[PDB]
Each structure stands twice: as C-alpha cells, then as structure tokens.
From a paper:
The [name] 50S large ribosomal subunit is composed of 33 proteins (L-proteins), one 23S and one [name]. The [name] consists of six architectural domains that, stabilized by the L-proteins, define the shape of the 50S subunit with its three protuberances.
Next, H68 can form upon integration of bL33 and bL35, while bL35 rigidifies the CP. In addition, the fixation of H68 seems to involve contacts with uL1. Accordingly, late step 1 assembly terminates with the “48S” particle C-CP-H68, sharing most structural features with a mature 50S subunit, but lacking a properly arranged FC.
Numbering used by the authors:
A (entry chain T): 1 to 93
B (entry chain 2): 1 to 46
C (entry chain C): 1 to 221, 252 to 271
Write the structure that this text describes.
Amino acid sequence: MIREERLLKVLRAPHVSEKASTAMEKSNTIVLKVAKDATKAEIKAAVQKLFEVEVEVVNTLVVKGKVKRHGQRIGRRSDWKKAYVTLKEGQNL
Amino acid sequence: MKRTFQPSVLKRNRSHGFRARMATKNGRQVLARRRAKGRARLTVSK
Amino acid sequence: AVVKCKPTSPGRRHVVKVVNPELHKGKPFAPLLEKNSKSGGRNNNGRITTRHIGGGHKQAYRIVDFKRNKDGIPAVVERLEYDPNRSANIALVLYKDGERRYILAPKGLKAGDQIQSGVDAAIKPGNTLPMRNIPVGSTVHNVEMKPGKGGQLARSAGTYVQIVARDGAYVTLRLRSGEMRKVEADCRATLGEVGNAEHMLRVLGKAGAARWRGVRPTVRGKGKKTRSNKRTDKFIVRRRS
RNA sequence: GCUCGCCGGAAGACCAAGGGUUCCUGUCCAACGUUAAUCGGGGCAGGGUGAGUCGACCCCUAAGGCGAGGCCGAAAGGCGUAGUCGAUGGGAAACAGGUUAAUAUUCCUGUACUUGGUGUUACUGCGAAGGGGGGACGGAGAAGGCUAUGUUGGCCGGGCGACGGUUGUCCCGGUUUAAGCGUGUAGGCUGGUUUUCCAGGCAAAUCCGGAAAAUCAAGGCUGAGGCGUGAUGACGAGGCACUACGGUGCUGAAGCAACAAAUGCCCUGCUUCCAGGAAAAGCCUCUAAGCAUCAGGUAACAUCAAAUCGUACCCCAAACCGACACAGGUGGUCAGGUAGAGAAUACCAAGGCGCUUGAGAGAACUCGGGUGAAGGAACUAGGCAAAAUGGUGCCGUAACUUCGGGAGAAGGCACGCUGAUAUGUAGGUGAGGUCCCUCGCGGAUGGAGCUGAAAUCAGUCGAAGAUACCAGCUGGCUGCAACUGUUUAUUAAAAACACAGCACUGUGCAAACACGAAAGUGGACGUAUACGGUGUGACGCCUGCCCGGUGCCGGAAGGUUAAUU
RNA sequence: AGGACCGAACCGACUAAUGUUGAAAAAUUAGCGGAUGACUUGUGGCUGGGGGUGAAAGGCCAAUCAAACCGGGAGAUAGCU
C-alpha cells in the first residue's frame, strides 16, 4: 500500500566507506543515500520490493552539507539522508 | 562586562521575523521597499 | 488581640501584630480559587496610571457572595478564614442543602452559628433581609446601593452605617464618612456589624511589610474639590463634615 | 618515554541558549598563528551524527499576542467575545558491559516497560464542550532512617627491596554489579462498613455534598530503603598462545564484614508563621440526545505501529558576546583524600595544562614584594598607603539604654608530642545466644570490632606549640541621619533618595485620578479602618500668635460682562 | 522568626596603586558592604521618544540623551571661518 514509482525514486544509491564496510561485515548492514523526505515506511517498502530481502529495522539520519568556498564564493553542499538497513537474513552484497 | 548583543534566535525571529513584520502594515511597506531595492535577505534566514 | 514584639532589632523593633487564634489554619477551600491575582497596576495600554503601585506577594482570589439570594435556607458557620484581598475576614457557611459559600464574618459571628436570609429571618446579627423590614435606628454593615449587587457600602473592617429614618419609599442612611444618603428600601441589608476592627493597631513594623503587600515607595515631587457628577445630587442629601 | 611545576566547588567532566561542520583521516606552508611553523580552530580530498524508551514534536494551559461577530474612530487604526497561538511549569516508557580514527541510554547479548489499532474468548449499560476526587503549588526549622561516596578488617594474586631493618600488626591493585519483578518495612495520612431520604453541583445523575439511623473501632491510602530473582550472567587484576608492534583469541579467584556520611531520598511530610502562597490537561465515577440482540466497555490471547526533527565539535572558552587565538561576561548538574566549623584557604586521586616569541646582560630608572640598628606619623592638606592583632574554651567586662543592646567591650589564663586515669573514658554504632513468637522486613536480653573528643596528673623537644594559608587593631570626644538599603553605568555612593510612623486634603461606586479624539483599562473583581495628592520622617517635651496679599472653601444688598433676541 | 551578626558562591565598585596611544572604548592587585530577603538570576511577554521608565541622578531607552536611530522637508538658514 506504498504505491509504485515512489519506491523506486525514494532511494538514490548505496554509500561506500570504511564504516560501511565494517557494518556490512559485522551486522550485515547496508548504508544508503536516499531522497530528502525518505520516510522509514517508504524505505522499508522499497527495500522489500526491490532487493527481495527482509529488513529487521530501518535507521535514518540527515547529513548536513559542507562548505567548499573557492575564494569570496561561499558555495554550500546539498542535503541528503543516510539510512542504515539491517537484513539479518540476506547474505548478499 | 556583559555586552549589549546577546544572541537569541527566538528573540530575533519574534522581534524581526517575517510573520511579525508582515503582521503590521508598516512592516509590509518595509518589505515592499526592501524588495524594490533588491536585498538578497529580506529579514533573516533561519 | 495585639502583641507587642520585643525590640530585638530595628525593623520589627516597634511592630504591632494583630493575631487572632480562632482563625482557621490551613489551606482554603480549593474549589473556590481562580484568576485575578496581582495585576501589577498596569492598564491595557501598559503605562503607569496608579503611581506608586506594583509588586507584592502572590495572593489567590476567593469568590465571596454578597447577593445572598439563598432565602429560607439556614446555614451553619464552620470556620473563619483570612482573605488577603480584603481586610475583613470571611466565614465558611455550609447551607442545609449542601452549598459551601463565603460571606463576610461580623463581629458577633463565631464558629457554630446559624444564619438564615429572607424576609422572615429573626432580627439578630448575621442575618440578611430587605431594608424594608429593618427597624429604624439599628446599625448595619454590607449595605447595598441598588438591589441585585450585594453590599456596596461598608465592607472594610470596622465599618458601620446607622439608619436614621425612612421618609417614604426611600431610606436615609448616615455613612461612616459622615454624610446622609437616600437609598432604595428594597435593597438587601445584613444585620450586625463587620468583624475584627483592629486594623489601625498594626503599624507594619518595617518597610518590607508594605513593600511585599504591593505598595511601592512614594517619591516627593489642597482643598480643591473635584466632585462633579450632577446625577446623584437628588440621591445624596449633604456631604461629609 | 622520563623528570619539575599549576588547577584539581577548576585551569576537570556532562547538558540548553549560543556558532553551524571548526570533529577524524590523507596531503601543502604563500597569507591566516603578534616569532621559524613538518603543527593547528589555515587551504584541498574523503568519512563521521543510527531513537516508541534522550529531548524536541504533540493534547490542553500562566504572563502575554492575534482575533470571526460587535463597539469606537475622518481611513490607516484602538480595545475586545467565542475561538486560536503562546514555557520559563505540568502528561507514556531503559540499564549493565563492548565496539569505531570520529557517533551511543541510538549498534551488539539480556532483562524489560508505556501507548494505539486489528481479530478471538467470556461478561455486560455504553455514551459529554458537564458535575465530583486529586492533579494543585508559600517563607523558615528540625530531628529519625536510608543511598551514592569515603575509611578500616578479612580475602584474592604478586613482592623480600639500587642504602641501615623489612616472612610481617609489611607494601602493591581489587574487593564493582543497573531497569524490572514479589515482599511493603522505617515514616506519614485517614476513622471505616451497611441502609433510607434531599430546595444543591445550570436539566438529571448509583458520583460529590447534605440529613437520618445499625455496626466495628481495625480497615484503607501513601511510603525511601534492604531482601531473593535480575545475575551458574557482565566486569576483574594477573596470566596462556598468535603480532603488520596498532593488536587478536582463551583463562581468570576473592569479589565479603564493621564505621562515617551527605546539599541526595523518605518529605508535594511534620511544627510555626503572616506576606495566606496559579490555570488546564492526563486518570477514575455518573448522568443530556442516542443506542438499549446493535454499537461500545471490561480481563486475557496473537499480531501491527509509535511518523518527523538535533544527536560531531567549545560550552566558566582560541569555537558565544566584546572589531582579535582579548588579564572581561555567560544558566543548570557531578562535588573524592589529608587537618579543619565549611562548597574559603594549604598539598594530593582521575582529568586538563606550563598559557605562541627565546637566549644572554645582571646598570640608572619603573612596577610587585623580603629584612633592616635609633626614633615611630616627627613627611604629607589628610594614619592616604603601609604596619600590627587575628582562633578555640575559661575568668572578667564600664557610661547609657527603648532593657533588645552597648560586648567578641577593655584586660588575662592553656594550646606541640608521648604515658597513666582509660593496652581507647562517657556517648554512638551496634553480630550470636536464652524465652516466647502472628513464627519473621518480630520483640526484654548481650557483647564482638570501630570514632573516640572533653577533663586531671606526669615526661620530653624548641626562642616561638592558632607556630603553614586563612584569620577584627584597640577606646574616648563630637556634628550629621531612626536603622537596613537605592541613584549620579563613565569626576561627587553622602550630610542626596526613599524608608516603617504621623498631619492635611479629595473621593458614595458608572467614585476621585490617570492612560486615551473613543470604545476600553488600572484604581478594584476593592467599598471611608479603602484609595489618590501634598509635607515631615522612629521614640520623649510642644507645633504657639497673625487672614495684609497670593491659591482654597461657603456667596451675597449690590457695580461690571459675552454668546442670544 | 530575626529586612541579625562573623563568614563562601553571587551581587555596584567605595578606598591607594597599575593601566591614561591598556589585556579591557571601565579590568586587575590588597582591604571594604549585603550574603533568608527593600535579595539575586535563567526563560517568555508589556511600558516606543515632547514619549517610556525612573526608592529622583533631569539617570537609562543599544559604547550617545537638558529630548535615541533611519529616509524625507533639505544643497534648511547663516550679517561667521
């Protein structure tokens, strides 16, 4: 009951980092960058109906953009949400 | 000694916020003239 | 009863305390506490209009009934309470039907007394009945100026009004200020006189007594009458002397 | 890596406002750092903030804001009803241990807990924008118990000392363990149960309140803490095997007794007191219309969900406010050891630092300090600055006085350590056992070990025994002011201000006055023992005579006078 | 209980010195007062300039005040430099 296209568009792409790798090898957790709203229910539905795997708990956080001023030109980064997804049953990448 | 400027977002946005300014007609004229001038930030950016 | 505290130190070196043991000790009737606390003496605009006022200790307001519309229902007085709003004390009267209301306690009213209003109440202190049934020459308190309000005259401590004559539908009084006024006889009146009249004995001891009561200091900066009403001249007979 | 020093009721740690990525890793020294700058709060790239149990959010609320109708005003606009916003308060729930370079009560093992929906079981009177309970409240004081915490004893594992002794009443580190569950103690509060009736709680009500009777006086409510589970669990020094020298896996015993004790809890309590010390929602009971096989409510069962927002970093400073990486200011919580009256002062535990220019020289002079023979305010407008006492218990303590005070008046007595009284005294803390015992969170008992002052005698050390820091100089005369306090931020802190009391004057309630073209509000949800204005300023002796003129009160034979006709 | 005393945090700096182109456009050194109430403070709201407020100095209203800041009258006027 989460509709279509919305589930496909909610998530942007997975995130790769040392912490992400440690989480993957410790608790089989997946770190994703998702849309702005990116509600927990929408993320759950998208993961269930896209990766065909079960999700135990969904945790999300907002990462504030940085500043990369080039000299008298203050340009701030955009805003994106980081979500941690725990499967507990899927031994996939 | 305690200085004059004591930062407070609540006080600033309640004494010079967009809604507070627009509540009275005088603030509406202030906003209109600021828009005519072309100020990037009308009142405050929370 | 006044107790002269020993002059241990200035500021309560010369204080006079007005204590009265029979007054109830403890919390008041909670269901009768509401708003109208310390206002600060500031109008809606926010400017000073009654200068030398402000502050004061927090005080709750107790609803007190003056109409005495309950007629023919005897009530028993249970205790006496001190009302910070008014100098005079109040009496907690429980009606036979179960009503618990407050009323100014006269001097002759003690705990465990029967009070009944109406046109058939006996002529004894504490009762209330229309002035049309009040014998001439009997002192009164809580006098009413127009029926339906209840006791607009003589509400402060030790205030009494002596009836001199009726002279037709109206009735002529003599207020404590020393002036005779004509009032509608249908107005309700309360027999007896108000309670404790020892208000002047206390001297407040020190500055704090007046300061925390809500009175600010008066800062230094005659016979010009300013009475101009021209509507109650007929009602009033002669001014004070 | 080591030595020396400072803070350690902070110069430490945790939070909200504050700033918004300064936090970690890799890399560079042009400027940014008052100096070189491989370093950093500087530049570039990458990573980091995980919530039903934190808080916000959110239901209703105080001060206060907006304001449909409506009032007023030439209009902008002013007040204001229903209503709606508005915390600085109130409402549902979590901890032990571990983890990353950086995040945790958020992730991992466990015990758990609050709320809402879904369907089932059996029962049944359910249903408010209403009533009632409590929510729900002030200053001060205290005793009695308990907890964190600290100390001592045993125990666990390791030691025989770079130099005189150190197998022992010697040293080293530990002797830690949550939320929940049942017990409901110490303590506090309340008098209960049954039946009939009722001008009240806007109409009604089994509910509250009121009136009658029968019965008991033992029933109920609240209530820290300890107890067993929690936990045959976690942690644990120190050890046994693998190392990219950063680290990895396993093992692991004591983990108990006594004392002290808090600002923390019992306590939103107890006593006193005048200055009499908020509202609403959350929860429970009944009724209005309605429904009365329905729908709903009751306890259990299985399941679902608790959306969204910050979780880095400093938070008495290099990160906030002061133009600065500034001798300044910034709310709340944690509060160890030594001696001590303590949260001041002196040194230490964990923790953080030696403060962004250094080395020599050892002159005059400037700043802050140490001692100085003789005099001791003699200098100076001026005891200004400086110098001296400084505590404990005892003796003693004047004039006056409102009998409270003066007063710590002035002036003297002893202050270390050791032994005896008494191998450690009174007090307190306080285990077993006898007797019974609802028989255990029972009582008369009787001493284990610990604090041990205070008091007398004796011995001894030095010039000084409060020997450190900390810590009143002392009395008299005299003008001013009742005392305490308040302002001239930034030349005058008072002899100025007010101050408790007193005197005069005006105010009859739609009160006087003030804010306002005006609705309206303060006065006051008060009523001449109250309020407004003026003058003086506790207390004792008095406020005496005078109405020319100036303001005020009561008004009159009379002279003068506009609008108006 | 004490608008009590001695005395911490806290509260305005009174006194001599430093600083007077400072560390600071008002602080520090060492004494001094209150420190249970006429006390102080955090968080929100109100009193808006011929007005506010003021235990009264004609103080404060943003490092300023015997009348704050901004735009306009306004290139005010000036027998003055």
